């Protein structure tokens, strides 16, 4: 069907994975701190 | 010199003559849709339209779930 090619992203796109998880965690703090309006 | 001729005779030795293994008959309950719709003759755009037909149903059906 398709040949799986190991192209690198894990040791390549780390700040955007970190930024996604960091906006996830900070937005979880925002929606568990500010959502009572 | 050597390399082009030998790369050619490696390239022209195993390549199959009549365009073999035609695979003009196969099915997995979705590949017939592909062979009728996406292979070397038709490749018509209407299946995406037919796929759009699904969303033509689907939001309507979700409308049928939501407001109607």
């Amino acid at each position: 069907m398709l040949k799986r090619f190991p192209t690198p992203i894990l040791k390549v796109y780390w700040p955007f994975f970190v930024a996604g998880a960091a906006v996830y965690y900070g937005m979880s703090k925002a929606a568990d701190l500010s959502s009572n309006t | 010199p050597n390399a082009k001729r030998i790369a050619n005779v490696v390239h022209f030795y195993k390549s199959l003559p009549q365009g073999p293994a035609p695979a003009i008959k196969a099915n997995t309950r979705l590949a017939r849709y592909k062979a009728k719709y996406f292979d070397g003759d038709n490749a018509s755009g209407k299946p995406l339209w037919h796929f759009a037909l699904g969303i033509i149903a689907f939001g309507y059906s979700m409308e049928y779930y939501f407001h109607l």
């Binding site: 069907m1 398709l2 192209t7 992203i9 390549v12 796109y13 700040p15 955007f16 970190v18 930024a19 996604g20 960091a22 906006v23 937005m27 | 695979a23 849709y33 592909k34 996406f38 292979d39 070397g40 490749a43 796929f51 759009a52 969303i55 033509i56 149903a57 689907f58 939001g59 309507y60 979700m62 409308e63």
Partner: protein
């Protein structure tokens, strides 16, 4: 079950429906469905080749591809009338924008340490106004972040609100007396050319997203 969860299911199956059923079993001749992906690959390739233009340029080339097609496809799905828009949420698109901007700041900080703040001077100035420029475009520094997503989110939101409001306009103007259908076709062709505009305001705004964040990678990654 969540509607947007299923909308992402629709996105991923459209994207699986662009290479696999495009594949006429690894025919190299590149059929009609494959020339489209060929063209998208080429026109993002020749874009980011010249933009960042470094010896390490292709590493982010899947990222500049995966930021485009996600926006190329999800902004052609809600062109279907009976659907709900995907990028309409300033929450989600501004989320993706803050993600990309923070990723650029973190990539630049990790790559260039103390003197990464010397991005913020473009070129030479006289001395008694040096600090000026730094704070001059400080909004852009963070104003850039909100704007990158807010542009595309505003375009998507106002376009879908345009289509709903003007469909309801041509609906509500025509419950009055039967002469209202006579020369009331110019609003219909107006909304039709608005849909001509709407394919543009999807695709070309996605290309805007691509070229602006490719410029932002040139900003963060390279030392000018």
């Amino acid at each position: 079950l969540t509607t947007f969860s299923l909308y992402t299911i629709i996105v991923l199956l459209v994207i699986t429906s662009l290479y696999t059923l495009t594949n006429n079993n690894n025919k190299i001749i590149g059929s009609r469905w494959l020339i489209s992906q060929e063209a998208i690959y080429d026109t993002i390739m020749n874009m980011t080749k010249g933009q960042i233009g470094g010896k390490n340029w292709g590493l982010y080339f899947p990222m500049i591809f995966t930021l485009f097609m996600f926006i190329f496809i999800a902004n052609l799905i809600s062109m279907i009338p009976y659907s709900f828009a995907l990028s309409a949420h300033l929450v989600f698109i501004i989320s993706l924008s803050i993600v990309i901007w923070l990723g650029n700041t973190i990539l630049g900080l990790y790559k260039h340490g103390w003197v990464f703040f010397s991005l913020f001077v473009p070129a030479g100035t006289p001395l008694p106004l040096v600090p000026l420029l730094v704070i001059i475009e400080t909004l852009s520094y963070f104003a850039r972040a909100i704007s990158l997503g807010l542009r595309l989110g505003s375009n998507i939101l106002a376009g879908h609100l345009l289509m709903v409001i003007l469909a309801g306009l041509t609906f509500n103007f025509m419950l009055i007396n039967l002469f209202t259908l006579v020369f009331g076709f110019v609003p219909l062709a107006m909304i039709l050319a608005i849909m001509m505009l709407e394919f543009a305001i999807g695709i070309i705004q996605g290309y805007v997203w691509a070229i602006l964040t490719a410029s932002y990678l040139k900003d963060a990654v390279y030392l000018h």
